[PDB]
Amino acid sequence: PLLLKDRKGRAYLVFPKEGGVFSVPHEALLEAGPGGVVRTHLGEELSVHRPTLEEYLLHMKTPTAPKDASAMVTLLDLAPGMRVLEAGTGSGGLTLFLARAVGEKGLVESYEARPHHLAQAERNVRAFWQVENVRFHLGKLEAAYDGVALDLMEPWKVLAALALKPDRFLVAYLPNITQVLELVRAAEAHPFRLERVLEVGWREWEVRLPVAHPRFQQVGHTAFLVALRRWK
Amino acid sequence: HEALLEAGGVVRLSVHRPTLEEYLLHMKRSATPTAPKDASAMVTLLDLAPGMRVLEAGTGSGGLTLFLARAVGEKGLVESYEARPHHLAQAERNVRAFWQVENVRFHLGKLEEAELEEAAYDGVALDLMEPWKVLEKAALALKPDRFLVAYLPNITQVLELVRAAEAHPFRLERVLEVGWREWEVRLPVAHPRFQQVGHTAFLVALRRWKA
Amino acid sequence: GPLLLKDRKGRAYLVFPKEGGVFVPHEALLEAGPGGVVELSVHRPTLEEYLLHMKRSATPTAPKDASAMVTLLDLAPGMRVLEAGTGSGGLTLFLARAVGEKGLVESYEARPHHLAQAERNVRAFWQVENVRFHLGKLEEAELEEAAYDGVALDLMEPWKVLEKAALALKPDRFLVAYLPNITQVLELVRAAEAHPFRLERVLEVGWREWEVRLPVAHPRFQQVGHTAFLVALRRWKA
Amino acid sequence: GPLLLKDRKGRALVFPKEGGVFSVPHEALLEAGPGGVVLSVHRPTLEEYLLHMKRSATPTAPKDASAMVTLLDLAPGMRVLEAGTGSGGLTLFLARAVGEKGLVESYEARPHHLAQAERNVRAFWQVENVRFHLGKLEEAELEEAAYDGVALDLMEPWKVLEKAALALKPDRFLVAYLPNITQVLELVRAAEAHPFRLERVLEVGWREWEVRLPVAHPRFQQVGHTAFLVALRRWKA
Ligand SMILES: C[S@@+](CC[C@H](N)C(=O)[O-])C[C@H]1O[C@@H](n2cnc3c(N)ncnc32)[C@H](O)[C@@H]1O
Ligand SMILES: C[S@@+](CC[C@H](N)C(=O)[O-])C[C@H]1O[C@@H](n2cnc3c(N)ncnc32)[C@H](O)[C@@H]1O
Ligand SMILES: C[S@@+](CC[C@H](N)C(=O)[O-])C[C@H]1O[C@@H](n2cnc3c(N)ncnc32)[C@H](O)[C@@H]1O
Ligand SMILES: C[S@@+](CC[C@H](N)C(=O)[O-])C[C@H]1O[C@@H](n2cnc3c(N)ncnc32)[C@H](O)[C@@H]1O
């Protein structure tokens, strides 16, 4: 697909089809294509782009944020050829990050309790990730898995007890420090050792020389990440 | 060492098959490795997907290579250069132990004088003292709408590289600091760590155009 | 004195009370009074709340930074501190408190339009007459040598006032400057080499807020990302 | 009064007594003076002093102590309540804000803590507007609605809301210095049962840069965390 951006930075995500109109023809968008510019009939100018998993997530049709999604893959030590349990799935986003990490051969197993959620998710993964390497289940989520990941309100519930090897993790993405602690206590019943709790930070700078300052506006918080390590 | 191997798991202590971050942090040294908080982010900044062809310089201890090599896949490839001989080795030695998959081609010598192909590279991951030098050599390799990401400690180098990128076909996309605010949680004691690593380096993202 | 009103959304309104004043009526607020309620709650505004809502011409210095600047200047009561520019008089109020009635704030502003609002704002909040306002550039003003305990700066080109600051400032005292761009920091720092100044501090102040409406408890989603760097230099002896 | 040096290595509090040395005698230090040379000599800042002074108990960090004043919204002439005195660090920040005509009424339960606390405040700050009391705050007899602020720094702060609310005027805050987040919620949870409308929960960060051109970067070694600041404004009864 393609990402169309203006002067302000507002971005438009387009899936071009022949005879397609965004009043701009997709043929003209493709003429330039990624790295090129197109001028509209109102003369606007919109730079044409091939989107990253970062930009797509943000403009695709409530996703897990890129900064955090990014970190989790590193938290789960996801390497190529692994199987990971996800729920999710909601709108996707974090799936793509995982599916990307497990490489064609590797599998990512995703569950989704609601229904209309998984519909949208697959649609998004469909139209960006042509590979079929994620296993989708429409439902509320032995020692065979290499990771577990959740973007639920209640990771403490579905605590996946045996569906995880030694040296594997469960990373939960919780926006309130209460939720963490409400989840952290539950590990006094299971074989786990809290290794980490952290809040990801991506501090954007504004550099338009000689202007150079951290951005006046930023998104201070999204959520915390908690890391657990199985025993045996 | 046996009880460890039969543990999985405690021992008379705890024990693990190391994760990429732990390895990196505890693996051996030649030059100071790129820290994990940024490497995690950098892979996303380069938009690395499985089957991609990424450029890299330098290797130092081989820390960045691993994050890249894991990311591009067995099919995908990481072409990576290094001009300090002892340094390339440890990266050669450190990567092989944790990454036995041979999807990483190694090179001795400056990236500046590399013999590379035009518009064959999906990304250029940079970590060295004077990034502005490889700008022409990186611009040739890189494709339209792809990125070069550089790992810069001082803000002065950021502005130096950003200034020099005027002569080359890039658009400055990002300058960012990566922050992982840690905690010490032996609950009900919960507080962010009193001791934190305040800063390693800024990340500079440059997007290629066509031409 | 002025009043501050807040609603269920946390949005705040700054009021000059009067008889017959119309907001809800005014003397109805008075009779309730600070901490009271009319659902709208009424307050004696803090120096922070004031700055963030006091009528502004030029942009006032942020409360988190102004707070830190007073500490970096090490201002105790009775000290004589220099200022430029007055802007809308925000940093001035912080400075005036710190040096007290026995002390003084010698402040310069180069724009007559800005200065009035700066003065109009100080006096509606600060009744103590320990501030001497001055019109014009600090670079052209006449000062006694080594007769100032501190120089507080908030302007775009602090490097042009370095010679007169180095003069006015006592031995071993501080000059702190409020600068948004890191490039302005480096310029000022390269220029400081040419005066009797030892560069002490370059820092970013951050007041990172939370929302606690238990059971919700987290750092605020939308935060004030950045204002400016604080650069502190100490005057030598000689 | 006191003096602080920095060496070529640039680190560290000389207390001049007649006929003594640091190797260069005190009288030599006074003559070279503030910004003078002998190691250099300076008249310490309140920030420098708090950090390098003797501490029986750990002081409030100057960035937090600085921010505590602004949240407490203290102007000259005010009467402010403090506990615990500890080593007397935050005590000095408070006293400067209220001025000669103001008052800092400060309590401290542990005697050895109050002792060196008094010695620390007095050596540095000789204006007489600090009131010391050995003992607890929840057991102190105070005038009702006669205090413009309450600065807290103890381990179980939720225990003085009742007594703090007594002293405080309408619309005046109670700002507390608390290391753990667990600590914070309990207070917010205890404050439910008291005439208090929670206004603020905030972290302070003074992020130092190292600038030695061409070198220019935020410091590798920072202070990760000290404590949260909790501001609680009182109801008009
Ligand atoms: C929104 S996604 C979380 C973010 C996701 N990782 C992403 O792509 O950014 C999770 C979605 O799955 C659904 N869901 C998750 N757990 C659920 C549960 N336990 N019961 C019902 N629905 C659930 C919710 O609709 C929610 O919107
Ligand atoms: C600081 S190390 C980075 C280590 C690596 N990123 C890691 O994670 O382990 C960077 C290395 O790049 C090398 N280098 C510097 N300039 C280079 C150049 N022009 N071409 C290739 N390597 C270079 C240096 O010798 C240095 O050892
Ligand atoms: C950002 S505003 C000051 C904000 C200040 N922190 C406050 O609370 O109002 C900058 C002001 O400094 C003044 N100024 C700029 N350059 C000056 C100079 N060289 N001498 C005196 N005043 C100056 C201008 O009038 C301008 O309104
Ligand atoms: C960590 S110190 C406080 C530090 C202080 N804010 C400073 O800047 O130096 C704790 C001290 O507070 C005192 N304290 C603790 N609880 C108290 C209470 N409930 N009432 C009065 N003092 C108390 C104890 O004497 C202890 O030595």
Question: Which residues of D are documented as binding site?
Answer: 87-90, 108, 113, 138, 153
The answer to whether the CB of D57 is under 6 A from ligand 4 is yes
Using alpha carbons only, what angle is made at residue D101 by residues D95 and D106, rounded to the nearest 5 degrees? 40
Tokens 């010490």: give the residue: B184
- The CB-side HSE value for D41 (13 A sphere, CA atoms) comes to 21
Q: Is residue C217 part of a domain?
A: no
- Distance between C218 CA and the closest CA of chain B, angstroms: 13
Q: Which long-range contacts (CB under 8 A, 24 or more apart) does C157-163 make?
A: C158/C184, C158/C188, C158/C231, C159/C187, C159/C188, C159/C191, C159/C192, C161/C84, C162/C188, C162/C191, C162/C192, C162/C194, C162/C195, C162/C197, C163/C195
Distance A137 CA to ligand 1 centre (A): 13
Q: Estimate the crossing angle of helix A94-102 against helix A66-75, to 10 degrees.
A: 40
Q: Estimate the crossing angle of helix B63-72 against helix B85-98, to 10 degrees.
A: 50
Nearest CA to ligand 3 atom 19: C137
Same domain, D30 and D103: no
Distance of CA D21 to the CA centre of its chain: 30
Asked if the Cβ–Cβ distance from D216 to B155 is below 8 Å, we say yes
- Distance between C192 CA and the closest CA of chain B, angstroms: 18
Report CA-CA distances (Å) from C130 to C96, C115, C127, D102: 7, 17, 9, 17
- Compute how many other C-beta atoms are within 10 angstroms of the C-beta atom of residue B130: 11
Q: Is residue C212 part of a domain?
A: no
Look up residue B133 and give its DSSP letter. G
Burial class (CB in 10 A: 0-12, 13-18, 19+), A186: middle
- Kindly report the backbone phi and psi dihedral angles of residue A208, in degrees, each rounded to the nearest multiple of 5, phi listed first: -130, 80
Nearest CA in chain D to C211: D201
Burial class (CB in 10 A: 0-12, 13-18, 19+), A187: middle
- Chain D residues touching chain A at CB-CB below 8 Å: 181-182, 185
Nearest CA to ligand 4 atom 12: D84
**Distance between CA atoms of A72 and A64, rounded to whole angstroms?**
11
Helical ranges in D125-234 per DSSP H? 161-167, 181-190
- Compute how many other C-beta atoms are within 10 angstroms of the C-beta atom of residue B54: 25
Pairing of the two strands B170-186 and B189-192? antiparallel
Write out chain A residues lying below 8 Å of B163, CB-based: 209
Q: Is C90 part of any known ligand binding site? A: yes
Q: Is A31 part of any known ligand binding site? A: no
Write out chain D residues lying below 8 Å of A178, CB-based: 185
Amino acid at residue number A151: D
SS3 A97: helix
Looking at residue C199, which CATH number applies to its domain? 3.40.50.150
Asked if the Cβ–Cβ distance from A74 to B40 is below 8 Å, we say yes
Write out chain D residues lying below 8 Å of C201, CB-based: 208
Which residues lie closer than 8 Å to C191 by C-beta, 6 or more apart?
A: C159, C162
Instruction: Among D53, D110, D162, D226, say which to mutate for ligand 4: greatest number of ligand atoms within 8 Å of CB.
Output: D110
- Domain finish residue from A31, A51, A71: A51
Tally of structural domains, chain C: 2
Q: Is residue A210 part of a domain?
A: no
Same domain, D60 and D115: yes
- Domain finish residue from A28, A51, A74: A51
- In SS3 terms, C99-121 reads as HCCCCEEEEEECCHHHHHHHHHH
The answer to whether the CB of A179 is under 6 A from ligand 1 is no
User: Token pair for residue C217?
Assistant: 């408890």
Instruction: Supply the Cα-derived Rg of chain D in whole angstroms.
Output: 20
Evaluate whether D205 touches B199 at the Cβ level (below 8 Å): no
- From start to end of C61-196, where are the E strands? 80-84, 104-109, 131-135, 148-153, 169-179
Q: Is residue D1 part of a domain?
A: yes
Largest CA distance in chain C: 61
The answer to whether the CB of D154 is under 6 A from ligand 4 is yes
Asked if the Cβ–Cβ distance from D182 to A181 is below 8 Å, we say yes
Q: Is B118 part of any known ligand binding site? A: no
Instruction: Among B32, B38, B127, say which to mutate for ligand 2: greatest number of ligand atoms within 8 Å of CB.
Output: B127
Instruction: Among A53, A89, A225, say which to mutate for ligand 1: greatest number of ligand atoms within 8 Å of CB.
Output: A89
Mutate which of C181, C182, C210 to disrupt the B interface (most B C-beta within 10 Å)? C182
Distance of CA D71 to the CA centre of its chain: 13
Same domain, C144 and C116: yes
Look up residue B111 and give its DSSP letter. G
Same domain, C18 and C65: no
Evaluate whether D2 touches D14 at the Cβ level (below 8 Å): yes
The answer to whether the CB of A113 is under 6 A from ligand 1 is yes
The answer to whether the CB of C63 is under 6 A from ligand 3 is no
- Distance between C189 CA and the closest CA of chain B, angstroms: 13
Distance C85 CA to ligand 3 centre (A): 3
**Peptide bond preceding D170 in cis form (omega within 30 of 0):** no
**Distance between CA atoms of D224 and C225, rounded to whole angstroms?**
18
Evaluate whether C104 touches C130 at the Cβ level (below 8 Å): yes
Write out chain A residues lying below 8 Å of D182, CB-based: 181
Evaluate whether C88 touches C59 at the Cβ level (below 8 Å): yes
**Distance between CA atoms of D187 and D184, rounded to whole angstroms?**
5
Same domain, D12 and D123: no
Same domain, C176 and C137: yes
Q: Is residue A127 part of a domain?
A: yes
Asked if the Cβ–Cβ distance from A217 to C208 is below 8 Å, we say no
Neighbours of chain C (3+ CB pairs under 8 A): A, B, D
Distance of CA D45 to the CA centre of its chain: 13
Same domain, D93 and D108: yes
Residue D222 has its nearest CB partner, among B155, B191, B196, at B196
Same domain, C24 and C139: no
First to last CA, chain B: 58
Same domain, A146 and A85: yes
Same domain, D77 and D187: yes
Which residues lie closer than 8 Å to B1 by C-beta, 6 or more apart?
A: none
**Distance between CA atoms of C174 and C72, rounded to whole angstroms?**
8
User: Token pair for residue B192?
Assistant: 């962010």
Range of the domain at D21: 1-44
Tokens 């700002």: give the residue: D175
Asked if the Cβ–Cβ distance from A177 to C227 is below 8 Å, we say no
b/e map of D99-109 (b: 16 or more CB within 10 Å)?
A: bbebbbbbbbb
**Distance between CA atoms of D166 and D154, rounded to whole angstroms?**
19
- From start to end of D12-109, where are the E strands? 36-37, 40-42, 79-83, 103-108
Same domain, A69 and A98: yes
- Residue B52: name the closest of B74, B35, B67, B36 by CA: B74
Q: Is residue C26 part of a domain?
A: yes
**Distance between CA atoms of B141 and A215, rounded to whole angstroms?**
31
Same domain, C132 and C227: yes
Q: Is residue D213 part of a domain?
A: no
Q: Is residue D214 part of a domain?
A: no
**Distance between CA atoms of D26 and D20, rounded to whole angstroms?**
6
Look up residue B103 and give its DSSP letter. -
Nearest CA to ligand 4 atom 5: D86
Per-position DSSP letters for C45-61, written without gaps between them: --HHHHHTTS--SSPPP
- Kindly report the backbone phi and psi dihedral angles of residue A108, in degrees, each rounded to the nearest multiple of 5, phi listed first: -130, 115
- Residue C64: name the closest of C213, C219, C203 by CA: C203
Evaluate whether B174 touches B204 at the Cβ level (below 8 Å): yes
Residue B8 has its nearest CB partner, among A50, A166, A185, at A166
Evaluated on CA atoms A230, A231, B5, B11, the torsion sign reads positive
**Resolution value, angstrom units:** 2.6
Evaluate whether B148 touches B206 at the Cβ level (below 8 Å): yes
